[PDB]
């Protein structure tokens, strides 16, 4: 009950010559891969740890001004001088004031005034960077057996965890009774951490763009500082007042924490307290099913009554899960399972939990199956006591075709050209489609970086109109397509 009911679930079906399939794993999503003669497996990337960070810059979000002093010189006599202006801990500004016999020196006119204050930082946000070789992806592989999961949240016993790091290109996991699953992931073309800063402010962290983080208008330290006193642009965090050209004063702006929370609107929040472990992004992996085998194929079919302990439940993914219990003999046996029509003449549905088996009599078994749209009957057991459980799917093949088209379109909107890697059996059409997607997405990312979804909507509307009101039919079609894709991306962005 890990990948069932997650609502971000993709069924990868089949393998290629070579017994490998291409799957992109996302943190909040799940992948269920099915191939004929092979156990169904669930995949989930559950953790991404970045180790050995290097602080790139330390920004000040809250300061205090102390040790304020001011200096002035009489008009025409040049700039005033402050010793504090020697030290870069003091933020200084120069201005003019009206001077005269009343103000206290010889002549009348605009005198020079310099006010300085010691800048001290009370709260800073630290931006950290990691090297791609230092990333580490935790992937859980749980055989979709139907055996009731052991006590816990699948962290132990059933469900094997594999750590995918760029040091080794082949990750191997032994699933007892199923053989070995080989994954060749690519943790180098995932997030692209060379362009990313790990920004943490106050028990909160974000995965932010590096240039964006370097363009932040706040006082900063180099990151190699170790002194934390020589901030660069302190003038962003102070304001000097000369309301009437009478005297100059410097006050300190308030805490920038809320303004920075607003600035982080589109960044994705991560965890940086107990290690730099984040839960956003994907991981393209090549799944090798060469040494994967169905478990319990040497067992005989169960000759005994099955009772449905938990009533058939429709899953979010057009599949049904039924929990059954065994009362017969021959403890470890194959559950006789089928989805047929009323007359029990045709097989209408595919069993997702392939090769269901009751290991022990006491333990129930969760079977997942995918019934067809409409009436179907789930047959369970041999004729004496055989269960015949009716089911109605409540859908259409056209409906699921449109729904899967929408899911693929959304995947392209999220994964860019990495969408073509999803469930790809090394095809040639997929290769050409991915190359075209790479070129088109490069152009699109150049043309639309740093614009908002409202801006994308406006641009898409404008381009669609330009295409519609075009004399050239080819240019018309091109512009209308570009505008429609841009409108789709604007509607489906900012999430």
């Amino acid at each position: 009950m890990r990948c069932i009911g997650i609502s971000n679930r993709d069924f990868v079906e089949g393998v290629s010559g070579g017994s490998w399939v291409d799957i992109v794993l996302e943190h909040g999503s799940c992948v269920t891969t099915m191939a004929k003669n092979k156990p169904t497996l669930d995949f989930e990337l559950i953790k991404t740890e970045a180790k050995h960070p290097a602080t790139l810059r330390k920004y000040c979000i809250e300061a205090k001004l102390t040790n304020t002093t001011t200096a002035s010189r009489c008009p025409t006599q040049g700039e005033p001088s402050l010793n504090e202006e020697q030290d870069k801990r003091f933020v200084c500004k120069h201005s003019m004031v009206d001077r005269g016999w009343g103000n206290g020196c010889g002549l009348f006119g605009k005198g020079g005034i310099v006010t300085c204050a010691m800048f001290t930082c009370k709260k800073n946000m630290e931006g950290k960077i990691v090297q791609p070789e230092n990333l580490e992806y935790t992937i859980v592989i749980t055989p979709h057996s139907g055996e009731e999961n052991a006590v816990g949240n699948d962290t132990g016993k059933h469900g094997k965890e594999i750590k995918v790091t760029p040091q080794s290109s082949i990750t191997e996991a032994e699933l007892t009774g199923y053989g070995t699953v080989t994954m060749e992931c690519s943790p180098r073309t995932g997030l692209d951490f060379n362009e990313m800063v790990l920004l943490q402010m106050e028990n909160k962290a974000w995965l932010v763009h590096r240039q964006w983080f370097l363009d932040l208008p706040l006082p900063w330290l180099p990151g190699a500082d170790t002194q934390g006193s020589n901030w660069i642009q302190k003038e962003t965090l102070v304001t000097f007042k000369n309301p009437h050209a009478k005297k100059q004063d410097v006050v300190v702006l308030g805490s920038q924490e809320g303004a920075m929370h607003t600035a982080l609107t589109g960044a994705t929040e991560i965890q940086m307290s107990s290690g730099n472990l984040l839960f956003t992004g994907h991981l393209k992996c090549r799944l090798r099913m060469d040494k994967l085998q169905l478990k319990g194929m040497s067992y005989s079919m169960c000759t005994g009554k099955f009772k449905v302990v938990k009533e058939i439940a429709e899953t979010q993914h057009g599949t049904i899960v039924i929990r059954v219990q065994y009362e017969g003999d021959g403890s470890p046996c194959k559950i006789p399972f089928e989805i047929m029509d009323l007359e029990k003449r045709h097989v209408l549905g595919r069993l997702i939990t392939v090769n269901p088996i009751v290991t022990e009599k006491d333990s129930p078994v969760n079977i997942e199956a995918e019934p067809p749209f409409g009436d179907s009957y789930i047959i369970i057991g041999v004729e004496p006591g055989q269960l015949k459980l009716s089911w109605f799917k409540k859908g259409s093949s056209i409906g699921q075709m449109f729904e899967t088209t929408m899911r693929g379109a959304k995947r392209m909107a999220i994964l860019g050209d990495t969408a073509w890697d999803f469930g790809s059996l090394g095809g040639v059409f997929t290769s050409i489609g991915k190359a075209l997607h790479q070129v088109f997405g490069a152009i699109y990312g150049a043309a639309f970086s740093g614009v908002s979804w409202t801006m994308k909507i406006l641009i898409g509307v404008v381009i669609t109109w330009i295409g519609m009101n075009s004399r050239s039919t080819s240019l018309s079609v091109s512009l209308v397509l570009v505008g429609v894709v841009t409108l789709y991306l604007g509607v489906m962005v900012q999430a």
Partner: antibody
Framework: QLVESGAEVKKPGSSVKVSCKAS????????ISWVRQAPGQGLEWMGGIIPIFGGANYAQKFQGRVTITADRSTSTVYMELSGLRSEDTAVYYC??????????????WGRGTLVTVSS | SVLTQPPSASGTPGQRVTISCSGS????????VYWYQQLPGTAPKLLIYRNNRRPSGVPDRFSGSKSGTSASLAISGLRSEDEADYYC???????????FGGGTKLTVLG
């Protein structure tokens, strides 16, 4: 790692809010249920809570009279019992369970909290 | 709610004692059965979880048996320390709640 509030003598018709202080791990990963045992009697199951999801479920015998709540800020689970009577005199237990619909193995148990009801 | 357990049990050292608690199909047969041993003045302790599983640290003397609609906790190597009240816990769907057994008294001639 399950800490319960100290014993408190109540009066008939009053209310009592027993507190179960869970740890960081159990609050976000397990479920918690409240079991009361009358003096010299068998255990009884009152209700249960999954702290990150709330929506506690109660036994029919106590539905409408008890309320289980979780304070995610302090990682604490609360049991409030109203209309206290002599039948409500018993030690109250908060135990941890795997949070699955089918898992009801209370590996962790509290030290107990005694509630006294009398005129 | 029909889950019944023998109110008391008697046994001698090194003499297996079976505490069989029955119930309805939904009550016991249709769900796991948990056995807890509760020494006086102490919180109940998990003995057998699911049907015949012993938690880590629980000695092997205790074993869990589950029949079609009844379950029995077997006590091998009976000892004075084992004397306690025993219950079997099982979720039952008709009542939509956890039902505890009435408990059994381990009256041991120690």
């Amino acid at each position: 790692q399950l800490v319960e509030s100290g014993a408190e003598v109540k009066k008939p018709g009053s209310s009592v809010k027993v507190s179960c202080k869970a740890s960081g791990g159990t609050f976000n990963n397990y479920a918690i249920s409240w079991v009361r045992q009358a003096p010299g009697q068998g255990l009884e199951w009152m209700g249960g809570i999954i702290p990150i999801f709330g929506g506690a479920n109660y036994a029919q015998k106590f539905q409408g009279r008890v309320t289980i709540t979780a304070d995610r800020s302090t990682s604490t689970v609360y049991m409030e019992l109203s209309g206290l009577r002599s039948e409500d005199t018993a030690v109250y237990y908060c135990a941890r369970r795997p949070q699955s619909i089918f898992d009801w193995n209370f590996d962790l148990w509290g030290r107990g909290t005694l509630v006294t009801v009398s005129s | 709610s029909v889950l019944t357990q023998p109110p008391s049990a008697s046994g001698t050292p090194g003499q297996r004692v079976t505490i069989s608690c029955s119930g309805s199909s939904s009550n016991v047969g249709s769900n796991y059965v948990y056995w807890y041993q509760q020494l006086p003045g102490t919180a109940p302790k998990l003995l057998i979880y699911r049907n015949n599983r012993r938690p880590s640290g629980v000695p092997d003397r205790f074993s869990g048996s589950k029949s079609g609609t009844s379950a029995s906790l077997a006590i091998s190597g009976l000892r004075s320390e084992d004397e306690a009240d025993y219950y079997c816990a099982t979720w039952d769907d008709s009542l939509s709640g956890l039902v505890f057994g009435g408990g059994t008294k381990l009256t041991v001639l120690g």
